[PDB]
Amino acid sequence: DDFAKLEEQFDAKLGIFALDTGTNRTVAYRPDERFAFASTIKALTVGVLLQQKSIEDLNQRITYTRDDLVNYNPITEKHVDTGMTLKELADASLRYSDNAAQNLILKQIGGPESLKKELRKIGDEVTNPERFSPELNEVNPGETQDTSTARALVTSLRAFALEDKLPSEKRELLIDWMKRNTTGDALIRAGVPDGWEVADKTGAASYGTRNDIAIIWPPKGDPVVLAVLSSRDKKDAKYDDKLIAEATKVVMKALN
Amino acid sequence: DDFAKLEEQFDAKLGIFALDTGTNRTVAYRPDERFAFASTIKALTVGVLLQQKSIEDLNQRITYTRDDLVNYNPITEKHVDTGMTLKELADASLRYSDNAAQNLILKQIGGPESLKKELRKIGDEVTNPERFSPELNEVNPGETQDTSTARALVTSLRAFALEDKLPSEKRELLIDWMKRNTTGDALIRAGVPDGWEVADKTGAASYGTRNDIAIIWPPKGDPVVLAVLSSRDKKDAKYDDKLIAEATKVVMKALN
Ligand SMILES: *C(=O)[C@@H]([C@@H]1N=C(C(=O)O)[C@@H](S[C@@H]2CN[C@H](C(=O)N(C)C)C2)[C@@H]1C)[C@@H](C)O
Ligand SMILES: *C(=O)[C@@H]([C@@H]1N=C(C(=O)O)[C@@H](S[C@@H]2CN[C@H](C(=O)N(C)C)C2)[C@@H]1C)[C@@H](C)O
Numbered sequence: 001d002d003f004a005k006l007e008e009q010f011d012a013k014l015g016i017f018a019l020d021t022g023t024n025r026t027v028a029y030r031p032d033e034r035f036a037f038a039s040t041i042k043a044l045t046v047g048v049l050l051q052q053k054s055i056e057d058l059n060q061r062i063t064y065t066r067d068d069l070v071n072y073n074p075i076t077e078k079h080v081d082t083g084m085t086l087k088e089l090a091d092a093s094l095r096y097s098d099n100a101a102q103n104l105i106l107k108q109i110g111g112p113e114s115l116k117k118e119l120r121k122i123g124d125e126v127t128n129p130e131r132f133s134p135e136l137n138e139v140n141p142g143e144t145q146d147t148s149t150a151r152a153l154v155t156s157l158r159a160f161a162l163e164d165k166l167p168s169e170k171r172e173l174l175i176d177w178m179k180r181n182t183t184g185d186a187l188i189r190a191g192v193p194d195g196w197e198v199a200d201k202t203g204a205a206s207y208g209t210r211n212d213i214a215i216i217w218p219p220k221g222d223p224v225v226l227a228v229l230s231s232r233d234k235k236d237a238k239y240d241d242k243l244i245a246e247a248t249k250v251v252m253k254a255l256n
Numbered sequence: 257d258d259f260a261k262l263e264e265q266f267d268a269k270l271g272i273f274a275l276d277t278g279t280n281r282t283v284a285y286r287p288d289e290r291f292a293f294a295s296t297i298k299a300l301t302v303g304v305l306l307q308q309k310s311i312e313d314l315n316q317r318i319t320y321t322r323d324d325l326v327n328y329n330p331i332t333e334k335h336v337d338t339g340m341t342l343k344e345l346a347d348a349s350l351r352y353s354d355n356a357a358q359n360l361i362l363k364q365i366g367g368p369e370s371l372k373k374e375l376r377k378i379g380d381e382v383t384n385p386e387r388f389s390p391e392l393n394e395v396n397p398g399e400t401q402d403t404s405t406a407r408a409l410v411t412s413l414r415a416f417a418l419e420d421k422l423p424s425e426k427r428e429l430l431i432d433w434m435k436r437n438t439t440g441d442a443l444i445r446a447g448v449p450d451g452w453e454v455a456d457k458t459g460a461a462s463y464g465t466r467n468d469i470a471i472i473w474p475p476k477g478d479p480v481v482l483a484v485l486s487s488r489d490k491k492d493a494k495y496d497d498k499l500i501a502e503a504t505k506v507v508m509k510a511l512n
Binding site: 078180182185194195196219220 | 330331332333334335337338352432435436438476
């Protein structure tokens with residue numbers, strides 16, 4: 001098995017689940033193993049923002065200071081003086097993984113416990129949002145706060161992006177943002193041929209956790225939804241993006 | 257001088273122009289020397305496309321056939337059967353240097369002769385569009401068809417991307433496609449300090465011509481607009497991407 005081999009090669013533990021929505025074929029490898037979701041949660045978080053706001057409501061302007069800024073604020077740091085609309089915060093959070101943007105959105109939806117409630121409402125009993133960004137990244141093995149599984153992230157991302165947890169114009173915003181992600185070139189995108197459209201959201205945390213979740217549109221045929229998660233046994237361990245890229249090529253082989 | 261030393265190391269001719277939009281300082285080395293523009297023209301071509309369409313017009317679906325495919329078609333070869341929208345064609349052209357994408361876009365704006373006339377209209381009396389792709393890359397020394405200069409490409413790229421040849425929303429589309437280019441990692445991007453954002457478009461053509469034009473954003477402050485062009489004296493000469501990267505570093509020192 002190629003997935004076992006990857007784990008061997010990169011001294012890491014993989015979580016994989018992929019679903020071909022056209023065939024209902026799946027590819028699983030530790031699909032129900034828990035991993036820190038890290039910033040992949042940003043995607044489900046915007047899912048819930050969109051469900052709870054009209055499109056026009058995303059034009060509301062959010063004011064903030066350097067106190068609402070945290071460790072990684074690539075877009076938010078530019079706009080302290082003017083603020084940002086919810087729409088521009090969605091963009092920043094999904095496409096640059098802006099942590100402060102995530103916290104600001106999370107506050108608009110009522111916080112982690114309110115995100116959790118909303119995910120339970122759409123059918124996800126697995127994903128456990130507990131903390132703000134960045135501290136959600138600090139997860140020790142055995143703990144369950146701020147964790148999910150490859151199976152559940154796929155199911156939940158599909159529910160918002162492709163099914164009926166959102167109306168079509170809102171699913172379109174979500175997919176556009178995710179399609180135009182900037183943080184993912186060496187991950188799922190590097191394990192798919194060019195001209196296969198990918199919408200993804202990356203994550204990284206402690207214990208060398210390195211995640212990517214995606215919807216992949218092959219040139220014709222229905223989309224594949226895919227989570228590829230990984231983690232290692234030392235708290236301060238490095239991850240290797242190539243593992244996600246290689247895993248991704250294995251999934252596509254197995255599905256075709 | 258460092259630029260001469262790069263010319264000597266790489267046995268090539270360099271064309272450099274950079275402009276610091278903050279201070280109006282410039283860095284020039286053979287700024288008015290002509291080079292084949294190659295696929296850098298794609299950026300300017302989208303600038304015109306954007307100027308002549310509403311953003312919503314970009315969703316017009318273009319149907320095309322396999323005759324429209326040329327030598328290098330990474331995205332467009334996957335969608336002969338469905339076609340692609342103008343928006344999707346712009347993305348393919350800019351982020352993958354898709355040649356067929358560029359030729360379809362060129363046909364939508366009326367062809368190279370029409371593109372040239374739109375460039376004259378924004379003030380560019382230098383850039384000489386004449387052929388479709390890839391034939392545009394066959395330029396012998398002393399010839400002027402499909403050539404420009406480092407100064408002109410910088411001037412024209414600024415005009416569309418930063419000044420008033422487009423309204424802000426279309427500038428934003430242009431800038432985002434170029435920020436997310438997949439073809440430029442070993443060029444200007446390699447000579448810029450980490451975490452400065454870069455929008456770029458690359459090119460290569462006969463006589464070992466190797467090009468990259470870009471906009472570079474210091475973390476705070478106004479952007480730098482940059483062209484780094486090169487060529488060599490044999491028709492079938494190889495280029496070296498490291499030339500462009502090293503020239504870029506020199507540009508950055510001379511501006512800091
Ligand atoms: C996400 O998991 C965390 C923030 N979002 C990120 C991302 O998904 O890219 C991280 S990733 C980590 C930081 N360094 C690596 C890198 O390639 N960069 C320099 C961006 C990846 C980012 C801190 C969030 C939980 O903090
Ligand atoms: C334009 O310059 C040509 C197309 N655009 C390119 C690019 O910018 O990437 C070229 S150049 C060259 C061929 N191999 C190099 C490479 O490393 N790859 C991207 C695979 C780039 C591409 C053919 C057009 C004029 O043909």
